[PDB]
């Protein structure tokens, strides 16, 4: 319904917040409303000593409903995966929006305190636009608009409904855990309640002192955990790498992928015949699954209409933003292997100018071609669908920056579009080396 | 045992941490060990979405054992009373240690994020000196030293014991809630599980939207809550002031003290015959009780030996620091109505020079006189025992600063002693006005 006036935003985290600012800066919408289940904005940057009550083991269903921790004396809490001693893996010269910088004397890879404070400051002017402690239950096109059903968080809230011209989903993709279904893991897990964990549960390393641990995974998250646990867990720390690894020291023993979990002997069978025993904790650092837990959108199975299948990615989203069949439904924040704030802002700026009619999306056929060419380059590896590892992210954010400049008419105040010059791209290229040196590792 | 070499510190919060630095700066002790039940230092500045599991209602026993939240997947969590949107009520020009300042561009009354980050930085060099996730169970003089019994926090830790020459208690006094035993409060509370709260449980104001609330108390904490709840709770907000109050608007109705709680009609009887009904939440902002939960010290009841009686204060502590009968037992952080970090540091510097023999405490008789004169000035109001409201705190911190200068010999590196000049004292005198104007209130 082209002339958009009432927009709904699902999520008040970094993505939803920059989406609101970009949208409001268009001066063309009469209503920009944000919905957030948490009592406060900032998404995951809301550190919680509280852990999830029940970790699905295994977890392969991207529809899984996030169950908050409730009590009679508190507001429902939605645990965040951030741990206590966490520090960014993204430099201050790159992370964060281009129109709000970090106070001087900030560490290059600061503690989450700094980023949580960052979000707080960024979100403040938007509090009157957000409906806090409110869970969006479903989203569907009814008649000529989108009907978003939502129940206020808090025991006894009544289910409510409101129509919108457009809807922007910024619900994040690090909530529903991904733990591959191995042989005998379910049983092994239920046998000893805290024996199997997922990165989303980690908080304080002191829990693992003296314990013999097995970290499964080889991505950044798993390597971080191996380092964090090195000074407390019993030596050596075991790590399961799909293809195995080269590190076999006294403190780190990389081993190949897992074959089976023997519940009766509690032995862990690794490919190649190697067997592990007396493992106090097994920690799955195998990431998450994308999720669109809204019945009206989840039922869509059709190749041309579906959004979610296995949770490896969100399908049918041109440029990772607009739902091809109906571009009044868009997503911001889907990007993988990027610098979240700048990339989400890049998408927001573009999204804003497209929904206010100051920019035109190419034909539906060409959008589908973009998708076709992308799928082909993935070679069956759909979980790389949204991945924009450098230089893809740089090219991408600069591509959106140049499409925005073409917006018309030119507003007196133009919501900024980030752009990565030669100096920025360089830092992004050696980002992990800059990080490694900063923390003295690798 | 004068020549002190091995010192134990109970608590790794602001008080315990500055105590460690001061102690280690004396270069006279062979062992300075800190004990902390939490997995990390910083005391209350460890924000926790987690609330206490069972709020005693009423609460009048200062011996009450703090029960952490346990689970099989996490380290035991000791909930802190800090709420989500909290900002200091102490200016950056005054709070914080004199040898570590706030980064530039910090708000004068910053968010807890800033202070939590502050503590993190301050505590880092002390991590190797702290025994984390370890609860001290008891403290007693055995033979010629102090035997501190402690059990590692974490299911299945074995009870351990270690002897020390001196022990410094910095366990804080904002844990054990104080809720006066009124007529029919226990029953009224147990009838509807979340009907009665204490400030230590507050976290997110959105919980109280639409609810009719009664804040009981008139101190700073209660006024803060009244303001925080004004934009969400049903109007008006009720506040119970011991002597009643002058504000009776549409949003705030101050009423006199509570007489009885009628459990069958759930009506709240206020002195003067006024009666309240349909009160969804009653929130006690009546502070805390001091606590010395160590059997060997709690059993002491004697006028000349006792430490705790009703929890209104810690008795027999000269200058609020040294246990008169045995000055090898000291307390830091007991001060009330002060600026915590500077005041605790002031005491630490003094404590350090007294335990290393570079300063001499006056006779036992004179110490007891100091106490006698203090008790007399309190006029039965023992809960004002440690209160050093300006200008007492200024005079006090400057008094300790001048006694420290007299230490001998002069060390190459002297642990700083804070001093409040004319400029500092002025800010401390109008502290609440400076705060009121900063937040635009009063
Ligand atoms: C362990 C960890 C470490 C990280 N470290 C970094 C780092 O160093 N640097 C970096 O750049 N990024 C880091 N990230 C990435 C992080 O995702 C981003 O910084 C940031 O979270 C971007 O968030 P967003 O708004 O897209 O999503 P964030 O209930 O995920 O999320 C969304 C918000 O929408 C809400 N929401 C979702 N669905 C609903 C619904 N149906 N109803 C109501 N509310 C809903 C959520 O509860 C939340 O408040 C890390 C993340 C993790 C988990
Ligand atoms: C709601 C609130 C707001 C505040 N706002 C401010 C403010 O704006 N400015 C300000 O200056 N102050 C403020 N304060 C005051 C605050 O007390 C101080 O900033 C700071 O906490 C000083 O702490 P400490 O080390 O003396 O105690 P903090 O388990 O209290 O405490 C002690 C530490 O010792 C540990 N411990 C105690 N007993 C044991 C044991 N037996 N075994 C093991 N560990 C033990 C504790 O668990 C903790 O980690 C506020 C406090 C509250 C509760």
PDB file of C-alpha atoms in Angstrom, chain A residues 78-306:
ATOM      1  CA  UNK A  78      14.098 -12.191  28.745  1.00  0.00           C
ATOM      2  CA  UNK A  79      17.649 -13.451  29.400  1.00  0.00           C
ATOM      3  CA  UNK A  80      20.333 -12.137  27.068  1.00  0.00           C
ATOM      4  CA  UNK A  81      23.269 -14.257  25.900  1.00  0.00           C
ATOM      5  CA  UNK A  82      25.913 -11.685  26.880  1.00  0.00           C
ATOM      6  CA  UNK A  83      28.378 -12.880  29.516  1.00  0.00           C
ATOM      7  CA  UNK A  84      29.888 -10.993  32.447  1.00  0.00           C
ATOM      8  CA  UNK A  85      33.401 -10.249  31.241  1.00  0.00           C
ATOM      9  CA  UNK A  86      32.418  -9.652  27.637  1.00  0.00           C
ATOM     10  CA  UNK A  87      34.295  -7.087  25.540  1.00  0.00           C
ATOM     11  CA  UNK A  88      33.533  -6.331  21.896  1.00  0.00           C
ATOM     12  CA  UNK A  89      35.215  -8.035  18.962  1.00  0.00           C
ATOM     13  CA  UNK A  90      34.502  -4.912  16.904  1.00  0.00           C
ATOM     14  CA  UNK A  91      36.666  -1.719  17.153  1.00  0.00           C
ATOM     15  CA  UNK A  92      35.148   1.604  18.238  1.00  0.00           C
ATOM     16  CA  UNK A  93      36.381   3.137  14.985  1.00  0.00           C
ATOM     17  CA  UNK A  94      33.867   0.948  13.231  1.00  0.00           C
ATOM     18  CA  UNK A  95      31.102  -0.181  15.546  1.00  0.00           C
ATOM     19  CA  UNK A  96      28.364   2.208  16.544  1.00  0.00           C
ATOM     20  CA  UNK A  97      26.292   4.566  14.451  1.00  0.00           C
ATOM     21  CA  UNK A  98      28.008   7.259  12.382  1.00  0.00           C
ATOM     22  CA  UNK A  99      26.062  10.070  14.055  1.00  0.00           C
ATOM     23  CA  UNK A 100      26.851   9.090  17.678  1.00  0.00           C
ATOM     24  CA  UNK A 101      30.410   8.397  18.706  1.00  0.00           C
ATOM     25  CA  UNK A 102      32.107   6.952  21.758  1.00  0.00           C
ATOM     26  CA  UNK A 103      33.227   9.193  24.591  1.00  0.00           C
ATOM     27  CA  UNK A 104      36.990   9.886  24.523  1.00  0.00           C
ATOM     28  CA  UNK A 105      39.301   7.433  26.297  1.00  0.00           C
ATOM     29  CA  UNK A 106      37.103   4.465  25.435  1.00  0.00           C
ATOM     30  CA  UNK A 107      38.976   1.171  24.936  1.00  0.00           C
ATOM     31  CA  UNK A 108      39.114   0.123  21.267  1.00  0.00           C
ATOM     32  CA  UNK A 109      37.322  -3.121  22.167  1.00  0.00           C
ATOM     33  CA  UNK A 110      35.336  -1.919  25.238  1.00  0.00           C
ATOM     34  CA  UNK A 111      33.443  -3.815  27.873  1.00  0.00           C
ATOM     35  CA  UNK A 112      29.734  -4.310  27.362  1.00  0.00           C
ATOM     36  CA  UNK A 113      29.121  -1.670  30.027  1.00  0.00           C
ATOM     37  CA  UNK A 114      30.253   0.926  27.487  1.00  0.00           C
ATOM     38  CA  UNK A 115      27.994  -0.464  24.756  1.00  0.00           C
ATOM     39  CA  UNK A 116      25.032  -0.914  27.111  1.00  0.00           C
ATOM     40  CA  UNK A 117      25.522   2.747  28.085  1.00  0.00           C
ATOM     41  CA  UNK A 118      25.869   3.541  24.387  1.00  0.00           C
ATOM     42  CA  UNK A 119      22.487   1.954  23.603  1.00  0.00           C
ATOM     43  CA  UNK A 120      20.839   3.640  26.603  1.00  0.00           C
ATOM     44  CA  UNK A 121      21.873   7.050  25.298  1.00  0.00           C
ATOM     45  CA  UNK A 122      20.851   6.224  21.728  1.00  0.00           C
ATOM     46  CA  UNK A 123      17.426   4.887  22.756  1.00  0.00           C
ATOM     47  CA  UNK A 124      16.368   7.594  25.232  1.00  0.00           C
ATOM     48  CA  UNK A 125      14.719   9.996  22.753  1.00  0.00           C
ATOM     49  CA  UNK A 126      12.748   7.016  21.417  1.00  0.00           C
ATOM     50  CA  UNK A 127      11.172   5.870  24.707  1.00  0.00           C
ATOM     51  CA  UNK A 128       7.924   7.705  24.000  1.00  0.00           C
ATOM     52  CA  UNK A 129       7.681   5.855  20.678  1.00  0.00           C
ATOM     53  CA  UNK A 130       8.209   2.389  22.186  1.00  0.00           C
ATOM     54  CA  UNK A 131       5.630   0.078  23.737  1.00  0.00           C
ATOM     55  CA  UNK A 132       7.744  -1.605  26.421  1.00  0.00           C
ATOM     56  CA  UNK A 133       7.121  -4.981  28.066  1.00  0.00           C
ATOM     57  CA  UNK A 134       4.956  -5.993  25.105  1.00  0.00           C
ATOM     58  CA  UNK A 135       5.281  -9.236  23.138  1.00  0.00           C
ATOM     59  CA  UNK A 136       4.154  -9.289  19.491  1.00  0.00           C
ATOM     60  CA  UNK A 137       2.361 -12.625  19.038  1.00  0.00           C
ATOM     61  CA  UNK A 138       1.570 -12.680  15.329  1.00  0.00           C
ATOM     62  CA  UNK A 139       1.777 -10.696  12.112  1.00  0.00           C
ATOM     63  CA  UNK A 140      -0.428 -11.055   9.036  1.00  0.00           C
ATOM     64  CA  UNK A 141      -1.812  -9.170   6.057  1.00  0.00           C
ATOM     65  CA  UNK A 142      -5.548  -8.734   6.504  1.00  0.00           C
ATOM     66  CA  UNK A 143      -7.493  -6.717   3.968  1.00  0.00           C
ATOM     67  CA  UNK A 144      -5.129  -3.969   2.819  1.00  0.00           C
ATOM     68  CA  UNK A 145      -2.839  -3.790   5.848  1.00  0.00           C
ATOM     69  CA  UNK A 146      -0.793  -5.677   8.410  1.00  0.00           C
ATOM     70  CA  UNK A 147      -2.483  -6.816  11.584  1.00  0.00           C
ATOM     71  CA  UNK A 148       0.039  -7.169  14.391  1.00  0.00           C
ATOM     72  CA  UNK A 149      -1.351  -8.997  17.407  1.00  0.00           C
ATOM     73  CA  UNK A 150       0.400  -8.208  20.695  1.00  0.00           C
ATOM     74  CA  UNK A 151      -0.053  -8.971  24.389  1.00  0.00           C
ATOM     75  CA  UNK A 152       1.398  -6.708  27.022  1.00  0.00           C
ATOM     76  CA  UNK A 153       4.083  -8.521  28.970  1.00  0.00           C
ATOM     77  CA  UNK A 154       2.857  -8.876  32.554  1.00  0.00           C
ATOM     78  CA  UNK A 155       0.534 -11.509  33.967  1.00  0.00           C
ATOM     79  CA  UNK A 156      -3.036 -10.877  32.883  1.00  0.00           C
ATOM     80  CA  UNK A 157      -2.523  -8.528  29.954  1.00  0.00           C
ATOM     81  CA  UNK A 158      -5.255  -8.743  27.301  1.00  0.00           C
ATOM     82  CA  UNK A 159      -4.458  -9.668  23.701  1.00  0.00           C
ATOM     83  CA  UNK A 160      -4.577  -6.550  21.541  1.00  0.00           C
ATOM     84  CA  UNK A 161      -4.493  -5.783  17.792  1.00  0.00           C
ATOM     85  CA  UNK A 162      -3.514  -2.850  15.563  1.00  0.00           C
ATOM     86  CA  UNK A 163      -3.229  -2.342  11.804  1.00  0.00           C
ATOM     87  CA  UNK A 164      -0.220  -0.895  10.006  1.00  0.00           C
ATOM     88  CA  UNK A 165       0.803  -0.011   6.468  1.00  0.00           C
ATOM     89  CA  UNK A 166       4.281  -1.496   6.919  1.00  0.00           C
ATOM     90  CA  UNK A 167       6.087  -3.689   9.446  1.00  0.00           C
ATOM     91  CA  UNK A 168       9.828  -3.890  10.117  1.00  0.00           C
ATOM     92  CA  UNK A 169      11.087  -7.002  11.890  1.00  0.00           C
ATOM     93  CA  UNK A 170      14.192  -6.368  13.982  1.00  0.00           C
ATOM     94  CA  UNK A 171      13.783  -9.234  16.459  1.00  0.00           C
ATOM     95  CA  UNK A 172      17.408 -10.393  16.330  1.00  0.00           C
ATOM     96  CA  UNK A 173      18.765 -13.842  15.458  1.00  0.00           C
ATOM     97  CA  UNK A 174      20.681 -14.905  18.567  1.00  0.00           C
ATOM     98  CA  UNK A 175      17.863 -16.219  20.756  1.00  0.00           C
ATOM     99  CA  UNK A 176      16.864 -19.675  19.547  1.00  0.00           C
ATOM    100  CA  UNK A 177      19.907 -21.924  20.155  1.00  0.00           C
ATOM    101  CA  UNK A 178      21.194 -24.364  17.584  1.00  0.00           C
ATOM    102  CA  UNK A 179      22.376 -27.666  19.003  1.00  0.00           C
ATOM    103  CA  UNK A 180      22.628 -30.434  16.352  1.00  0.00           C
ATOM    104  CA  UNK A 181      20.788 -33.647  17.143  1.00  0.00           C
ATOM    105  CA  UNK A 182      23.553 -36.169  17.792  1.00  0.00           C
ATOM    106  CA  UNK A 183      23.178 -39.836  18.739  1.00  0.00           C
ATOM    107  CA  UNK A 184      22.186 -40.073  22.397  1.00  0.00           C
ATOM    108  CA  UNK A 185      22.592 -36.400  23.303  1.00  0.00           C
ATOM    109  CA  UNK A 186      19.039 -35.895  24.558  1.00  0.00           C
ATOM    110  CA  UNK A 187      19.340 -38.770  27.025  1.00  0.00           C
ATOM    111  CA  UNK A 188      22.905 -37.880  28.015  1.00  0.00           C
ATOM    112  CA  UNK A 189      21.756 -34.323  28.700  1.00  0.00           C
ATOM    113  CA  UNK A 190      18.642 -35.181  30.750  1.00  0.00           C
ATOM    114  CA  UNK A 191      20.672 -37.651  32.827  1.00  0.00           C
ATOM    115  CA  UNK A 192      22.827 -34.965  34.492  1.00  0.00           C
ATOM    116  CA  UNK A 193      20.991 -31.562  34.357  1.00  0.00           C
ATOM    117  CA  UNK A 194      23.981 -29.240  33.960  1.00  0.00           C
ATOM    118  CA  UNK A 195      26.172 -31.555  31.869  1.00  0.00           C
ATOM    119  CA  UNK A 196      25.306 -29.956  28.542  1.00  0.00           C
ATOM    120  CA  UNK A 197      25.273 -26.204  27.924  1.00  0.00           C
ATOM    121  CA  UNK A 198      25.072 -23.757  25.012  1.00  0.00           C
ATOM    122  CA  UNK A 199      26.978 -20.451  24.773  1.00  0.00           C
ATOM    123  CA  UNK A 200      23.781 -18.493  25.530  1.00  0.00           C
ATOM    124  CA  UNK A 201      23.979 -19.815  29.096  1.00  0.00           C
ATOM    125  CA  UNK A 202      27.574 -18.826  29.833  1.00  0.00           C
ATOM    126  CA  UNK A 203      27.997 -15.976  32.348  1.00  0.00           C
ATOM    127  CA  UNK A 204      30.754 -16.447  34.878  1.00  0.00           C
ATOM    128  CA  UNK A 205      33.833 -18.588  34.227  1.00  0.00           C
ATOM    129  CA  UNK A 206      34.346 -19.341  37.952  1.00  0.00           C
ATOM    130  CA  UNK A 207      31.584 -21.945  37.664  1.00  0.00           C
ATOM    131  CA  UNK A 208      33.930 -24.227  35.728  1.00  0.00           C
ATOM    132  CA  UNK A 209      36.921 -24.254  38.067  1.00  0.00           C
ATOM    133  CA  UNK A 210      38.284 -27.786  38.430  1.00  0.00           C
ATOM    134  CA  UNK A 211      35.777 -29.038  35.889  1.00  0.00           C
ATOM    135  CA  UNK A 212      36.772 -30.928  32.723  1.00  0.00           C
ATOM    136  CA  UNK A 213      35.170 -29.178  29.774  1.00  0.00           C
ATOM    137  CA  UNK A 214      34.448 -29.868  26.116  1.00  0.00           C
ATOM    138  CA  UNK A 215      33.778 -26.873  23.889  1.00  0.00           C
ATOM    139  CA  UNK A 216      32.132 -27.927  20.614  1.00  0.00           C
ATOM    140  CA  UNK A 217      32.561 -25.571  17.689  1.00  0.00           C
ATOM    141  CA  UNK A 218      35.323 -23.679  15.936  1.00  0.00           C
ATOM    142  CA  UNK A 219      33.852 -20.230  15.289  1.00  0.00           C
ATOM    143  CA  UNK A 220      34.840 -17.046  17.163  1.00  0.00           C
ATOM    144  CA  UNK A 221      32.454 -17.771  20.038  1.00  0.00           C
ATOM    145  CA  UNK A 222      34.015 -21.167  20.744  1.00  0.00           C
ATOM    146  CA  UNK A 223      37.566 -19.827  20.664  1.00  0.00           C
ATOM    147  CA  UNK A 224      36.577 -17.055  23.069  1.00  0.00           C
ATOM    148  CA  UNK A 225      35.180 -19.614  25.515  1.00  0.00           C
ATOM    149  CA  UNK A 226      38.296 -21.787  25.278  1.00  0.00           C
ATOM    150  CA  UNK A 227      40.401 -18.771  26.258  1.00  0.00           C
ATOM    151  CA  UNK A 228      38.018 -17.647  29.007  1.00  0.00           C
ATOM    152  CA  UNK A 229      37.928 -21.137  30.529  1.00  0.00           C
ATOM    153  CA  UNK A 230      41.662 -21.762  30.293  1.00  0.00           C
ATOM    154  CA  UNK A 231      42.515 -20.125  33.595  1.00  0.00           C
ATOM    155  CA  UNK A 232      39.846 -22.039  35.586  1.00  0.00           C
ATOM    156  CA  UNK A 233      38.875 -25.421  34.134  1.00  0.00           C
ATOM    157  CA  UNK A 234      40.940 -28.541  34.689  1.00  0.00           C
ATOM    158  CA  UNK A 235      43.642 -28.824  32.023  1.00  0.00           C
ATOM    159  CA  UNK A 236      43.350 -29.598  29.190  1.00  0.00           C
ATOM    160  CA  UNK A 237      40.269 -28.008  27.662  1.00  0.00           C
ATOM    161  CA  UNK A 238      38.734 -30.057  24.864  1.00  0.00           C
ATOM    162  CA  UNK A 239      37.376 -28.570  21.674  1.00  0.00           C
ATOM    163  CA  UNK A 240      35.446 -30.414  18.986  1.00  0.00           C
ATOM    164  CA  UNK A 241      36.212 -29.057  15.506  1.00  0.00           C
ATOM    165  CA  UNK A 242      34.204 -30.375  12.547  1.00  0.00           C
ATOM    166  CA  UNK A 243      37.399 -31.292  10.728  1.00  0.00           C
ATOM    167  CA  UNK A 244      39.528 -31.500  13.850  1.00  0.00           C
ATOM    168  CA  UNK A 245      42.329 -29.067  14.578  1.00  0.00           C
ATOM    169  CA  UNK A 246      46.070 -28.602  14.927  1.00  0.00           C
ATOM    170  CA  UNK A 247      46.279 -27.550  18.589  1.00  0.00           C
ATOM    171  CA  UNK A 248      47.052 -30.451  20.927  1.00  0.00           C
ATOM    172  CA  UNK A 249      48.790 -28.926  23.937  1.00  0.00           C
ATOM    173  CA  UNK A 250      48.551 -29.396  27.678  1.00  0.00           C
ATOM    174  CA  UNK A 251      45.872 -26.720  28.011  1.00  0.00           C
ATOM    175  CA  UNK A 252      44.090 -27.222  24.681  1.00  0.00           C
ATOM    176  CA  UNK A 253      43.230 -30.501  22.939  1.00  0.00           C
ATOM    177  CA  UNK A 254      41.357 -29.962  19.687  1.00  0.00           C
ATOM    178  CA  UNK A 255      39.505 -33.069  18.566  1.00  0.00           C
ATOM    179  CA  UNK A 256      37.263 -33.951  15.625  1.00  0.00           C
ATOM    180  CA  UNK A 257      33.445 -33.798  15.437  1.00  0.00           C
ATOM    181  CA  UNK A 258      31.192 -35.826  17.766  1.00  0.00           C
ATOM    182  CA  UNK A 259      29.650 -39.137  16.685  1.00  0.00           C
ATOM    183  CA  UNK A 260      27.682 -40.355  19.703  1.00  0.00           C
ATOM    184  CA  UNK A 261      27.071 -39.694  23.383  1.00  0.00           C
ATOM    185  CA  UNK A 262      26.971 -42.901  25.404  1.00  0.00           C
ATOM    186  CA  UNK A 263      24.398 -42.245  28.146  1.00  0.00           C
ATOM    187  CA  UNK A 264      25.240 -45.348  30.198  1.00  0.00           C
ATOM    188  CA  UNK A 265      29.009 -44.815  30.251  1.00  0.00           C
ATOM    189  CA  UNK A 266      28.846 -41.053  29.668  1.00  0.00           C
ATOM    190  CA  UNK A 267      31.642 -41.324  27.111  1.00  0.00           C
ATOM    191  CA  UNK A 268      31.795 -38.994  24.119  1.00  0.00           C
ATOM    192  CA  UNK A 269      32.641 -40.633  20.797  1.00  0.00           C
ATOM    193  CA  UNK A 270      34.639 -38.479  18.394  1.00  0.00           C
ATOM    194  CA  UNK A 271      35.051 -39.228  14.695  1.00  0.00           C
ATOM    195  CA  UNK A 272      38.241 -41.181  14.120  1.00  0.00           C
ATOM    196  CA  UNK A 273      37.724 -43.491  17.068  1.00  0.00           C
ATOM    197  CA  UNK A 274      38.956 -41.119  19.775  1.00  0.00           C
ATOM    198  CA  UNK A 275      36.861 -41.363  22.942  1.00  0.00           C
ATOM    199  CA  UNK A 276      36.438 -38.862  25.791  1.00  0.00           C
ATOM    200  CA  UNK A 277      35.307 -39.611  29.353  1.00  0.00           C
ATOM    201  CA  UNK A 278      34.776 -37.819  32.695  1.00  0.00           C
ATOM    202  CA  UNK A 279      33.602 -34.671  30.902  1.00  0.00           C
ATOM    203  CA  UNK A 280      31.879 -32.522  33.505  1.00  0.00           C
ATOM    204  CA  UNK A 281      30.531 -29.927  31.065  1.00  0.00           C
ATOM    205  CA  UNK A 282      29.878 -30.011  27.346  1.00  0.00           C
ATOM    206  CA  UNK A 283      29.386 -26.506  25.935  1.00  0.00           C
ATOM    207  CA  UNK A 284      27.808 -26.086  22.510  1.00  0.00           C
ATOM    208  CA  UNK A 285      29.118 -22.952  20.792  1.00  0.00           C
ATOM    209  CA  UNK A 286      27.212 -23.746  17.614  1.00  0.00           C
ATOM    210  CA  UNK A 287      25.384 -20.468  17.238  1.00  0.00           C
ATOM    211  CA  UNK A 288      21.705 -19.820  16.733  1.00  0.00           C
ATOM    212  CA  UNK A 289      18.871 -20.215  14.236  1.00  0.00           C
ATOM    213  CA  UNK A 290      16.956 -17.450  12.531  1.00  0.00           C
ATOM    214  CA  UNK A 291      13.367 -17.264  13.711  1.00  0.00           C
ATOM    215  CA  UNK A 292      10.048 -15.770  12.605  1.00  0.00           C
ATOM    216  CA  UNK A 293       7.711 -16.961  15.445  1.00  0.00           C
ATOM    217  CA  UNK A 294       4.565 -15.414  14.013  1.00  0.00           C
ATOM    218  CA  UNK A 295       1.997 -18.065  12.953  1.00  0.00           C
ATOM    219  CA  UNK A 296       0.791 -16.116   9.925  1.00  0.00           C
ATOM    220  CA  UNK A 297       4.337 -15.887   8.576  1.00  0.00           C
ATOM    221  CA  UNK A 298       5.611 -19.252   9.783  1.00  0.00           C
ATOM    222  CA  UNK A 299       2.886 -21.232   8.012  1.00  0.00           C
ATOM    223  CA  UNK A 300       4.128 -19.876   4.675  1.00  0.00           C
ATOM    224  CA  UNK A 301       5.984 -22.826   3.129  1.00  0.00           C
ATOM    225  CA  UNK A 302       5.845 -21.952  -0.585  1.00  0.00           C
ATOM    226  CA  UNK A 303       9.167 -21.299  -2.381  1.00  0.00           C
ATOM    227  CA  UNK A 304       7.913 -17.871  -3.429  1.00  0.00           C
ATOM    228  CA  UNK A 305       6.346 -16.935  -0.084  1.00  0.00           C
ATOM    229  CA  UNK A 306       8.198 -18.726   2.726  1.00  0.00           C
TER     230      UNK A 306
END
